[PDB]
Design a protein around this ligand. Sequence first.
Ligand code: MG
Ligand code: MG
Ligand code: MG
Ligand code: MG
Ligand code: MG
Ligand code: MG
Ligand code: MG
Ligand code: MG
Ligand code: MG
Ligand code: MG
Ligand code: MG
Ligand code: MG
Ligand code: MG
Ligand code: MG
Ligand code: MG
Ligand code: MG
Ligand code: MG
Ligand code: MG
Ligand code: MG
Ligand code: MG
Ligand code: MG
Ligand code: MG
Ligand code: MG
Ligand code: MG
Ligand code: MG
Ligand code: MG
Ligand code: MG
Ligand code: MG
Ligand code: MG
Ligand code: MG
Ligand code: MG
Ligand code: MG
Ligand code: MG
Ligand code: MG
Ligand code: MG
Ligand code: MG
Ligand code: MG
Ligand code: MG
Ligand code: MG
Ligand code: MG
Ligand code: MG
Ligand code: MG
Ligand code: MG
Ligand code: MG
Ligand code: MG
Ligand code: MG
Ligand code: MG
Ligand code: MG
Ligand code: MG
Ligand code: MG
Ligand code: MG
Ligand code: MG
Ligand code: MG
Ligand code: MG
Ligand code: MG
Ligand code: MG
Ligand code: MG
Ligand code: MG
Ligand code: MG
Ligand code: MG
Ligand code: MG
Ligand code: MG
Ligand code: MG
Ligand code: MG
Ligand code: MG
Ligand code: MG
Ligand code: MG
Ligand code: MG
Ligand code: MG
Ligand code: MG
Ligand code: MG
Ligand code: MG
Ligand code: MG
Ligand code: MG
Ligand code: MG
Ligand code: MG
Ligand code: MG
Ligand code: MG
Ligand code: MG
Ligand code: MG
Ligand code: MG
Ligand code: MG
Ligand code: MG
Ligand code: MG
Ligand code: MG
Ligand code: MG
Ligand code: MG
Ligand code: MG
Ligand code: MG
Ligand code: MG
Ligand code: MG
Ligand code: MG
Ligand code: MG
Ligand code: MG
Ligand code: MG
Ligand code: MG
Ligand code: MG
Ligand code: MG
Ligand code: MG
Ligand code: MG
Ligand code: MG
Ligand code: MG
Ligand code: MG
Ligand code: MG
Ligand code: MG
Ligand code: MG
Ligand code: MG
Ligand code: MG
Ligand code: MG
Ligand code: MG
Ligand code: MG
Ligand code: MG
Ligand code: MG
Ligand code: MG
Ligand code: MG
Ligand code: MG
Ligand code: MG
Ligand code: MG
Ligand code: MG
Ligand code: MG
Ligand code: MG
Ligand code: MG
Ligand code: MG
Ligand code: MG
Ligand code: MG
Ligand code: MG
Ligand code: MG
Ligand code: MG
Ligand code: MG
Ligand code: MG
Ligand code: MG
Ligand code: MG
Ligand code: MG
Ligand code: MG
Ligand code: MG
Ligand code: MG
Ligand code: MG
Ligand code: MG
Ligand code: MG
Ligand code: MG
Ligand code: MG
Ligand code: MG
Ligand code: MG
Ligand code: MG
Ligand code: MG
Ligand code: MG
Ligand code: MG
Ligand code: MG
Ligand code: MG
Ligand code: MG
Ligand code: MG
Ligand code: MG
Ligand code: MG
Ligand code: MG
Ligand code: MG
Ligand code: MG
Ligand code: MG
Ligand code: MG
Ligand code: MG
Ligand code: MG
Ligand code: MG
Ligand code: MG
Ligand code: MG
Ligand code: MG
Ligand code: MG
Ligand code: MG
Ligand code: MG
Ligand code: MG
Ligand code: MG
Ligand code: MG
Ligand code: MG
Ligand code: MG
Ligand code: MG
Ligand code: MG
Ligand code: MG
Ligand code: MG
Ligand code: MG
Ligand code: MG
Ligand code: MG
Ligand code: MG
Ligand code: MG
Ligand code: MG
Ligand code: MG
Ligand code: MG
Ligand code: MG
Ligand code: MG
Ligand code: MG
Ligand code: MG
Ligand code: MG
Ligand code: MG
Ligand code: MG
Ligand code: MG
Ligand code: MG
Ligand code: MG
Ligand code: MG
Ligand code: MG
Ligand code: MG
Ligand code: MG
Ligand code: MG
Ligand code: MG
Ligand code: MG
Ligand code: MG
Ligand code: MG
Ligand code: MG
Ligand code: MG
Ligand code: MG
Ligand code: MG
Ligand code: MG
Ligand code: MG
Lengths: 97, 147
Amino acid sequence: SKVCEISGKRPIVANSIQRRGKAKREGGVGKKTTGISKRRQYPNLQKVRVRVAGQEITFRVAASHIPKVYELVERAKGLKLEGLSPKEIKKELLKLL
Amino acid sequence: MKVILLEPLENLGDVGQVVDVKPGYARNYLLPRGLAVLATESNLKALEARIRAQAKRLAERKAEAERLKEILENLTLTIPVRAGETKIYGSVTAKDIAEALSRQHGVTIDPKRLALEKPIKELGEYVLTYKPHPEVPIQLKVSVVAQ
RNA sequence: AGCCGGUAGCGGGCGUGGAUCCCUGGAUGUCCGAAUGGGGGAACCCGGCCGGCGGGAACGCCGGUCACCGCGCGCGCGGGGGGAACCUGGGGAACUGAAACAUCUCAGUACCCAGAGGAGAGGAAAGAGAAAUCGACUCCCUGAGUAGCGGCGAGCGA
RNA sequence: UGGUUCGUGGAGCCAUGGGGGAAUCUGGGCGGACCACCGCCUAAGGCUAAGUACUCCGGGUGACCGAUAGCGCACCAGUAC
RNA sequence: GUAGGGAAACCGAGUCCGAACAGGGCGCAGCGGCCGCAAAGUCCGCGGCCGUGGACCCGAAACCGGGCGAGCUAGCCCUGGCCAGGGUGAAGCUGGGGUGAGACCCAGUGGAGGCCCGAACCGGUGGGGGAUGCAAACCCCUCGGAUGAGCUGGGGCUAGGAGUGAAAAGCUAACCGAGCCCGGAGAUAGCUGGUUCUCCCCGAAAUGACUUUAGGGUCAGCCUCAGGCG
RNA sequence: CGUAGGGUUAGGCGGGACCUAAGGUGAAGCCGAAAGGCGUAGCCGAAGGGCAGCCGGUUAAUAUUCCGGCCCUUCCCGCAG
RNA sequence: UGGUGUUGGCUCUUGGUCGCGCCUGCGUAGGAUAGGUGGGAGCCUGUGAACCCCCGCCUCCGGGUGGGGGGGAGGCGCCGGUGAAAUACCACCCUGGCGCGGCUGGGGGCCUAACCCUCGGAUGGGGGGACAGCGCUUGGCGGGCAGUUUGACUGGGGCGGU
RNA sequence: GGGCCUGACUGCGAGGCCUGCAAGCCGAGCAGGGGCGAAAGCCGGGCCUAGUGAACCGGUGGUCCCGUGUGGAAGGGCCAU
Ligand SMILES: [Mg+2]
Ligand SMILES: [Mg+2]
Ligand SMILES: [Mg+2]
Ligand SMILES: [Mg+2]
Ligand SMILES: [Mg+2]
Ligand SMILES: [Mg+2]
Ligand SMILES: [Mg+2]
Ligand SMILES: [Mg+2]
Ligand SMILES: [Mg+2]
Ligand SMILES: [Mg+2]
Ligand SMILES: [Mg+2]
Ligand SMILES: [Mg+2]
Ligand SMILES: [Mg+2]
Ligand SMILES: [Mg+2]
Ligand SMILES: [Mg+2]
Ligand SMILES: [Mg+2]
Ligand SMILES: [Mg+2]
Ligand SMILES: [Mg+2]
Ligand SMILES: [Mg+2]
Ligand SMILES: [Mg+2]
Ligand SMILES: [Mg+2]
Ligand SMILES: [Mg+2]
Ligand SMILES: [Mg+2]
Ligand SMILES: [Mg+2]
Ligand SMILES: [Mg+2]
Ligand SMILES: [Mg+2]
Ligand SMILES: [Mg+2]
Ligand SMILES: [Mg+2]
Ligand SMILES: [Mg+2]
Ligand SMILES: [Mg+2]
Ligand SMILES: [Mg+2]
Ligand SMILES: [Mg+2]
Ligand SMILES: [Mg+2]
Ligand SMILES: [Mg+2]
Ligand SMILES: [Mg+2]
Ligand SMILES: [Mg+2]
Ligand SMILES: [Mg+2]
Ligand SMILES: [Mg+2]
Ligand SMILES: [Mg+2]
Ligand SMILES: [Mg+2]
Ligand SMILES: [Mg+2]
Ligand SMILES: [Mg+2]
Ligand SMILES: [Mg+2]
Ligand SMILES: [Mg+2]
Ligand SMILES: [Mg+2]
Ligand SMILES: [Mg+2]
Ligand SMILES: [Mg+2]
Ligand SMILES: [Mg+2]
Ligand SMILES: [Mg+2]
Ligand SMILES: [Mg+2]
Ligand SMILES: [Mg+2]
Ligand SMILES: [Mg+2]
Ligand SMILES: [Mg+2]
Ligand SMILES: [Mg+2]
Ligand SMILES: [Mg+2]
Ligand SMILES: [Mg+2]
Ligand SMILES: [Mg+2]
Ligand SMILES: [Mg+2]
Ligand SMILES: [Mg+2]
Ligand SMILES: [Mg+2]
Ligand SMILES: [Mg+2]
Ligand SMILES: [Mg+2]
Ligand SMILES: [Mg+2]
Ligand SMILES: [Mg+2]
Ligand SMILES: [Mg+2]
Ligand SMILES: [Mg+2]
Ligand SMILES: [Mg+2]
Ligand SMILES: [Mg+2]
Ligand SMILES: [Mg+2]
Ligand SMILES: [Mg+2]
Ligand SMILES: [Mg+2]
Ligand SMILES: [Mg+2]
Ligand SMILES: [Mg+2]
Ligand SMILES: [Mg+2]
Ligand SMILES: [Mg+2]
Ligand SMILES: [Mg+2]
Ligand SMILES: [Mg+2]
Ligand SMILES: [Mg+2]
Ligand SMILES: [Mg+2]
Ligand SMILES: [Mg+2]
Ligand SMILES: [Mg+2]
Ligand SMILES: [Mg+2]
Ligand SMILES: [Mg+2]
Ligand SMILES: [Mg+2]
Ligand SMILES: [Mg+2]
Ligand SMILES: [Mg+2]
Ligand SMILES: [Mg+2]
Ligand SMILES: [Mg+2]
Ligand SMILES: [Mg+2]
Ligand SMILES: [Mg+2]
Ligand SMILES: [Mg+2]
Ligand SMILES: [Mg+2]
Ligand SMILES: [Mg+2]
Ligand SMILES: [Mg+2]
Ligand SMILES: [Mg+2]
Ligand SMILES: [Mg+2]
Ligand SMILES: [Mg+2]
Ligand SMILES: [Mg+2]
Ligand SMILES: [Mg+2]
Ligand SMILES: [Mg+2]
Ligand SMILES: [Mg+2]
Ligand SMILES: [Mg+2]
Ligand SMILES: [Mg+2]
Ligand SMILES: [Mg+2]
Ligand SMILES: [Mg+2]
Ligand SMILES: [Mg+2]
Ligand SMILES: [Mg+2]
Ligand SMILES: [Mg+2]
Ligand SMILES: [Mg+2]
Ligand SMILES: [Mg+2]
Ligand SMILES: [Mg+2]
Ligand SMILES: [Mg+2]
Ligand SMILES: [Mg+2]
Ligand SMILES: [Mg+2]
Ligand SMILES: [Mg+2]
Ligand SMILES: [Mg+2]
Ligand SMILES: [Mg+2]
Ligand SMILES: [Mg+2]
Ligand SMILES: [Mg+2]
Ligand SMILES: [Mg+2]
Ligand SMILES: [Mg+2]
Ligand SMILES: [Mg+2]
Ligand SMILES: [Mg+2]
Ligand SMILES: [Mg+2]
Ligand SMILES: [Mg+2]
Ligand SMILES: [Mg+2]
Ligand SMILES: [Mg+2]
Ligand SMILES: [Mg+2]
Ligand SMILES: [Mg+2]
Ligand SMILES: [Mg+2]
Ligand SMILES: [Mg+2]
Ligand SMILES: [Mg+2]
Ligand SMILES: [Mg+2]
Ligand SMILES: [Mg+2]
Ligand SMILES: [Mg+2]
Ligand SMILES: [Mg+2]
Ligand SMILES: [Mg+2]
Ligand SMILES: [Mg+2]
Ligand SMILES: [Mg+2]
Ligand SMILES: [Mg+2]
Ligand SMILES: [Mg+2]
Ligand SMILES: [Mg+2]
Ligand SMILES: [Mg+2]
Ligand SMILES: [Mg+2]
Ligand SMILES: [Mg+2]
Ligand SMILES: [Mg+2]
Ligand SMILES: [Mg+2]
Ligand SMILES: [Mg+2]
Ligand SMILES: [Mg+2]
Ligand SMILES: [Mg+2]
Ligand SMILES: [Mg+2]
Ligand SMILES: [Mg+2]
Ligand SMILES: [Mg+2]
Ligand SMILES: [Mg+2]
Ligand SMILES: [Mg+2]
Ligand SMILES: [Mg+2]
Ligand SMILES: [Mg+2]
Ligand SMILES: [Mg+2]
Ligand SMILES: [Mg+2]
Ligand SMILES: [Mg+2]
Ligand SMILES: [Mg+2]
Ligand SMILES: [Mg+2]
Ligand SMILES: [Mg+2]
Ligand SMILES: [Mg+2]
Ligand SMILES: [Mg+2]
Ligand SMILES: [Mg+2]
Ligand SMILES: [Mg+2]
Ligand SMILES: [Mg+2]
Ligand SMILES: [Mg+2]
Ligand SMILES: [Mg+2]
Ligand SMILES: [Mg+2]
Ligand SMILES: [Mg+2]
Ligand SMILES: [Mg+2]
Ligand SMILES: [Mg+2]
Ligand SMILES: [Mg+2]
Ligand SMILES: [Mg+2]
Ligand SMILES: [Mg+2]
Ligand SMILES: [Mg+2]
Ligand SMILES: [Mg+2]
Ligand SMILES: [Mg+2]
Ligand SMILES: [Mg+2]
Ligand SMILES: [Mg+2]
Ligand SMILES: [Mg+2]
Ligand SMILES: [Mg+2]
Ligand SMILES: [Mg+2]
Ligand SMILES: [Mg+2]
Ligand SMILES: [Mg+2]
Ligand SMILES: [Mg+2]
Ligand SMILES: [Mg+2]
Ligand SMILES: [Mg+2]
Ligand SMILES: [Mg+2]
Ligand SMILES: [Mg+2]
Ligand SMILES: [Mg+2]
Ligand SMILES: [Mg+2]
Ligand SMILES: [Mg+2]
Ligand SMILES: [Mg+2]
Ligand SMILES: [Mg+2]
Ligand SMILES: [Mg+2]
Ligand SMILES: [Mg+2]
Ligand SMILES: [Mg+2]
Ligand SMILES: [Mg+2]
Ligand SMILES: [Mg+2]
Ligand SMILES: [Mg+2]
Ligand SMILES: [Mg+2]
Ligand SMILES: [Mg+2]
Ligand SMILES: [Mg+2]
Ligand SMILES: [Mg+2]
Ligand SMILES: [Mg+2]
Ligand SMILES: [Mg+2]
C-alpha cells in the first residue's frame, strides 16, 4: 500500500459499481446500478533487495517496474559508489532515473 | 527472460551462450550467484566484442604458426657432431636443435615445444615435428652429420 | 514658522544658523514567535566553543557562533513560516430535489490538505472533424438550453 | 475505474490501478463498436509573456446608509462580558 | 420572423397515412385615395402572472464536514496520602491428654477476616422542610459502608457512531437513544403564526374526476378583468 | 470599596542549573493519498528519589530570607599528607 | 474463495497437446486380417530365399507382427481369381495404442534462493517456504455497520373489512 | 337444425354518444380483395351491458426510413405483435 520508488505509481480512487440485471446486448431490459462506493486500487508493491557496491539496497516498487531496478544497477557500474552509505547509494541510483 | 551464462551449467547451457529462463530463476539465483547476466543490449554488445576479440587472437596465432611453417618446412637443419661410424659420442638434444636453429637459419624456437623424447644418439636424417600450436604441426627435417 | 503625539497642567526646553512636520535611505531594534544551541507550561529556563569585562579561577554579564532537511564540492547555496479573496493539485460530504427513495440530484459544491504567486492554470496538435477546412493556449459574446445525457424521471448539458 | 453531454449504451476518445506486451516512418495514434477506403495528426521530456481571476491595500464615484441604519465596531471592539 | 407537413429519407402550398387522382389529420388564401393609412413581425419601456434561485418573513426536530473538550463525570496507568476507639478470636505454635504410631480433645499463647460496633471519611434508606430556595439537588432528623471489590491528593491516557460503563442506553463540563463550537446554511417544514395607506366597482367556494390522496394538489365548476359577438 | 504612598530580602525553605515514574516526545527505523500514525536509545516529565539551618530578636506591613548566636553545603585555588 | 502478479529449481504420477519411432485395422465376396488417397508393373536376397523349432506382442481363434538359429539362392506381384475398392514396392494421411521428446493442465515428494519468523554474532546461521503475506480480479457469506422503505379508506386509530 | 364459408377484413371514416383530462362507445359511407344469397341485400366477430391496465424499458416478425468523412456494419426509427 503506497508509492513506487521508481514509477511514482500511487494509490488511486475508484468506484466499485454493483449491477443487477440482464444486459441489453443479450436481450435483457438493461442493467440497473444497485450501488456505487469509493475504494482504492493500490500498486502491486513488492520489495526488491539488491547488492550494489558491496551494500544491500532495497526498493519498494511496483511489480511492473521490477526490471527497472536491475537496469539501474547496470547503469550504476559507471559510478564511484564504494564506501558510500546505503542511503547515499540509493540516491545515486534513483538519480539515474 | 534471456540471460547470458557466465559458466557452464548442468542442463541449461554453456558459458557465453544465451538462454531463456523464468525471471524468478534469473533474478533470485543466477544473477546473485554471479552465474549469469541479463541479456540487455548494453551487455550483448560486450559478449559480441568478447567473441570478436578471442577470434582475433585465435586466428592471429594460427597465422604466427602457419607463417612459421613457411620459415621451417623449407630448410634442413644440419648438425655436425663428433661421432664414429654412425653412433654419436655425446648427443643432439632438443635444447641443441633449438640452439642450432638460431645460429644458422635465424629462427628462434622453444626446445620444450619440440617433440623429441630421448636425445638423438645416431647419425642420419631425422624428421621432427614442432607443435607451436595444436592443429598446426610443423616438419623440421634435421640432418645430423659427422665432423 | 512654529514646536516638545491624543494632552490641558506642573516643571523645563527647542526653532529663519530653518525646528516641529512629510517622503526616501540607513542605524538601533529586549524577549517570544517558522523560531533554529538545548529545554519549555510562547514571551521563561539551561548550556558548548571563541573573544571581552570584574580582583576574577569558581560566579556573573557583554559580543560572535552552534537546529533540522534538500542540492552541489566540512564549506557553499536553498528550504521551513505568513498572507483577505483569487488559483492549481490531492482528497471529498449531507441536508435538499426527485412532492416517499436506492440509481440520479445537490456537486466535484461545503470542507480538509499540499502548493504556487502577484496571479495561478493552460499552451505551440499523436488537435479538431468533414470544411477538398482550420491552425498553440487563455478569456468574453454567440453557437444553445442546441446536440445529446436521463429510474428517457427529477433533472443534467457539451 | 475516472473524465466528457455520454448513468453500459452501438461506447469510441482522454486518463490509469492489474495482467500481458511491440515497433522507429514499410513506424505509430485519430476521424464514436468493427472492417475497407479516404483523410488528419506525430504519444510516451521540459519551458513560455499577454489577453483572465481576486481585493488585505490606495484613490475616485454613488437616483448607497445615516447611529435599531451602514461593517460586529462612527466612540479605545473583536473590547466588555 | 418570412412555410408547412413527415419518425425519417423527403416533398412543399402543401404534406402525412394510403394501391387511391378515396377519405381524413396537420397546413396554405387589410382600408382608403401609384400615394398615404392600418398590419405580420420584431425591438425597447411598463404592468400582471409563470419557471429557476432562499423567491413573502419568522420557526424545527434532524443530516453532513472540519475542529474543541476527560480541570465535570466514567475507566485505567504512575506516584503519594488516609482509615479514632472498642469487640469477636481462624490458622499456627507451646503444653497437657490420647494412641502402636495417629486422628483427634483440652488449655494457654496467637492475632486471621470483602468479621462485628462506631467517628473521621465515603454514601444517600425513610421522613419532614425547602420549592420566584441558603442551594439549577440544599437543610434537619434517620439511616448504609467504614482493612476493603475502601477512600483520597498530585501526575497521566482513552471521545463522538467514538470512549468509558460491577449495565442505568448510565456518564463523556448543570437537559446525551449519539457531546459542543463553527461551517454546508437562508437545510427542509404539503404545518402553525404574521403580512403595514385610502376610496370606488364586481364578488366567489367548501363540489366532481383523479391523486402513497384525504386539512396538500391537477383539471373542470363557481368570481373577476380586457377584447370580440349581439 | 475610591485615591495615594509604602510593603514581599534566602548558598541551607520550595522549584530550577540533579534523578528518573506513568505518560509524552523521539537519532535509528517502520507505516500512511496529503495532513499525519507509530518507534528500542536518548530527552522531557514529580506531590517519588537525592540534597546543606536551628533557636531567638526586629517592622505599620517580610523574615528558617534582615539581625544575633551557634552550625553546615558545593564549587575554585593553594598547601600538606 | 477461483484465476493472475510478487513466483523459483529438481523429481514422480496422471491429463491435453504437437514432433518422431512406430506398430495397428478381420461384412457378403475374395487364397489370407484388403484403414484411405494417390505414385505403381515391379520389388526383395553374402545388407544370405524356400522352410524346421524356442521367446515377446496383439490376439475376430484364424492368425498378425516383432526376435533368435539352420537352411541359405528363393519369394510376392502386374495378369487372373476377386470385391465398392486387391495385392509386390514408395509415399501423404487417419482408428487405436506404445516408448522417447517438446510444450503444457492437474495432483505427490523434495530443494532454496524470492517472501515471512528468528539467532549476543548479520554479504552469515537456524526455521517456515514458493506456501503464507501483500496487488488486481471472480463468486459467495455478511444488522458487525450504513442509507432507507414499511399504502389509503375509516363515525378517532388499530384490529377486521375494503 | 342444416349448407356454403372466415367480413373474428385491409385502407380510411361524415357525424355523434359520453366526458375535467386521458380514455371508453356507436357508426353510415367510399376504395381494395372476399363470403353467403336467384335477388333485395347482409357480413369490419359474438342479443347487449363485465372478461381489464396508460407510459417507460425490453423481446420477436416485417419495413428498408436514419446510419457520426465515404461504402457497409453496429445501433436505432416505422408497421405488427
Ligand atoms: Mg468492483
Ligand atoms: Mg448491452
Ligand atoms: Mg437486437
Ligand atoms: Mg441504467
Ligand atoms: Mg523480491
Ligand atoms: Mg501494468
Ligand atoms: Mg508485467
Ligand atoms: Mg504628553
Ligand atoms: Mg509653567
Ligand atoms: Mg509650558
Ligand atoms: Mg533644506
Ligand atoms: Mg524610516
Ligand atoms: Mg537588556
Ligand atoms: Mg527571537
Ligand atoms: Mg530555542
Ligand atoms: Mg525546539
Ligand atoms: Mg551563547
Ligand atoms: Mg570565557
Ligand atoms: Mg569587586
Ligand atoms: Mg574572567
Ligand atoms: Mg552570550
Ligand atoms: Mg511549505
Ligand atoms: Mg510560501
Ligand atoms: Mg480537485
Ligand atoms: Mg499530492
Ligand atoms: Mg477528487
Ligand atoms: Mg467521507
Ligand atoms: Mg442523498
Ligand atoms: Mg437545500
Ligand atoms: Mg424542484
Ligand atoms: Mg425527497
Ligand atoms: Mg418532498
Ligand atoms: Mg422518510
Ligand atoms: Mg436522497
Ligand atoms: Mg437545491
Ligand atoms: Mg456530480
Ligand atoms: Mg478540491
Ligand atoms: Mg468557499
Ligand atoms: Mg504556503
Ligand atoms: Mg496581470
Ligand atoms: Mg503567467
Ligand atoms: Mg506558469
Ligand atoms: Mg513540439
Ligand atoms: Mg439557433
Ligand atoms: Mg454534473
Ligand atoms: Mg479501460
Ligand atoms: Mg461517469
Ligand atoms: Mg442508450
Ligand atoms: Mg464513452
Ligand atoms: Mg495500466
Ligand atoms: Mg503510416
Ligand atoms: Mg503501422
Ligand atoms: Mg491512443
Ligand atoms: Mg485506441
Ligand atoms: Mg478508429
Ligand atoms: Mg481525428
Ligand atoms: Mg487529427
Ligand atoms: Mg506548465
Ligand atoms: Mg509580452
Ligand atoms: Mg494570464
Ligand atoms: Mg481589478
Ligand atoms: Mg477602497
Ligand atoms: Mg445625508
Ligand atoms: Mg446609537
Ligand atoms: Mg451599529
Ligand atoms: Mg438619533
Ligand atoms: Mg471599520
Ligand atoms: Mg451592531
Ligand atoms: Mg455600536
Ligand atoms: Mg471597549
Ligand atoms: Mg389533405
Ligand atoms: Mg405604423
Ligand atoms: Mg409593435
Ligand atoms: Mg401565469
Ligand atoms: Mg438561493
Ligand atoms: Mg426569498
Ligand atoms: Mg416569487
Ligand atoms: Mg430555518
Ligand atoms: Mg441533538
Ligand atoms: Mg439518518
Ligand atoms: Mg448517520
Ligand atoms: Mg461531527
Ligand atoms: Mg470528527
Ligand atoms: Mg479523572
Ligand atoms: Mg476529574
Ligand atoms: Mg504509591
Ligand atoms: Mg476504616
Ligand atoms: Mg477498628
Ligand atoms: Mg480496632
Ligand atoms: Mg506462628
Ligand atoms: Mg500438641
Ligand atoms: Mg489456639
Ligand atoms: Mg488476647
Ligand atoms: Mg482483630
Ligand atoms: Mg467489615
Ligand atoms: Mg463491621
Ligand atoms: Mg458525629
Ligand atoms: Mg486528619
Ligand atoms: Mg467528596
Ligand atoms: Mg453513588
Ligand atoms: Mg435522604
Ligand atoms: Mg423517620
Ligand atoms: Mg427529601
Ligand atoms: Mg421531600
Ligand atoms: Mg414538600
Ligand atoms: Mg428542585
Ligand atoms: Mg442532617
Ligand atoms: Mg447512625
Ligand atoms: Mg452513621
Ligand atoms: Mg447497623
Ligand atoms: Mg463493606
Ligand atoms: Mg460500621
Ligand atoms: Mg470494620
Ligand atoms: Mg468491607
Ligand atoms: Mg486495594
Ligand atoms: Mg491512588
Ligand atoms: Mg488519584
Ligand atoms: Mg490531573
Ligand atoms: Mg487522577
Ligand atoms: Mg481507556
Ligand atoms: Mg478520550
Ligand atoms: Mg478530540
Ligand atoms: Mg455523534
Ligand atoms: Mg461504542
Ligand atoms: Mg462502575
Ligand atoms: Mg460545555
Ligand atoms: Mg454535557
Ligand atoms: Mg452532564
Ligand atoms: Mg445527565
Ligand atoms: Mg442522532
Ligand atoms: Mg449521526
Ligand atoms: Mg469552521
Ligand atoms: Mg445547501
Ligand atoms: Mg433557505
Ligand atoms: Mg424532509
Ligand atoms: Mg414538519
Ligand atoms: Mg407583506
Ligand atoms: Mg354586489
Ligand atoms: Mg369535494
Ligand atoms: Mg385522472
Ligand atoms: Mg388510486
Ligand atoms: Mg399511486
Ligand atoms: Mg397534506
Ligand atoms: Mg382551477
Ligand atoms: Mg357564468
Ligand atoms: Mg376567465
Ligand atoms: Mg367586455
Ligand atoms: Mg483600599
Ligand atoms: Mg541565610
Ligand atoms: Mg552553573
Ligand atoms: Mg532537568
Ligand atoms: Mg532525565
Ligand atoms: Mg509520536
Ligand atoms: Mg517510548
Ligand atoms: Mg540530563
Ligand atoms: Mg522533586
Ligand atoms: Mg522531594
Ligand atoms: Mg536544590
Ligand atoms: Mg533544599
Ligand atoms: Mg542547624
Ligand atoms: Mg503577616
Ligand atoms: Mg515587613
Ligand atoms: Mg543568619
Ligand atoms: Mg601534592
Ligand atoms: Mg479475493
Ligand atoms: Mg500465484
Ligand atoms: Mg521441506
Ligand atoms: Mg530448508
Ligand atoms: Mg532461508
Ligand atoms: Mg520443513
Ligand atoms: Mg499465494
Ligand atoms: Mg508488501
Ligand atoms: Mg479474474
Ligand atoms: Mg465482491
Ligand atoms: Mg439498520
Ligand atoms: Mg442482510
Ligand atoms: Mg447503529
Ligand atoms: Mg437522505
Ligand atoms: Mg414504498
Ligand atoms: Mg409505501
Ligand atoms: Mg390513515
Ligand atoms: Mg372505528
Ligand atoms: Mg378522516
Ligand atoms: Mg364515517
Ligand atoms: Mg365517533
Ligand atoms: Mg367523527
Ligand atoms: Mg389492516
Ligand atoms: Mg367457394
Ligand atoms: Mg367523431
Ligand atoms: Mg372525449
Ligand atoms: Mg361482394
Ligand atoms: Mg365490397
Ligand atoms: Mg354467386
Ligand atoms: Mg360496414
Ligand atoms: Mg353468443
Ligand atoms: Mg360477450
Ligand atoms: Mg377495451
Ligand atoms: Mg419511468
Ligand atoms: Mg413510472
Ligand atoms: Mg422501444
Ligand atoms: Mg459511415
Ligand atoms: Mg441508407
Ligand atoms: Mg466513423
Ligand atoms: Mg465495399
Ligand atoms: Mg448508402
Ligand atoms: Mg450485408
Ligand atoms: Mg437493421
Ligand atoms: Mg430494424
Ligand atoms: Mg407501432
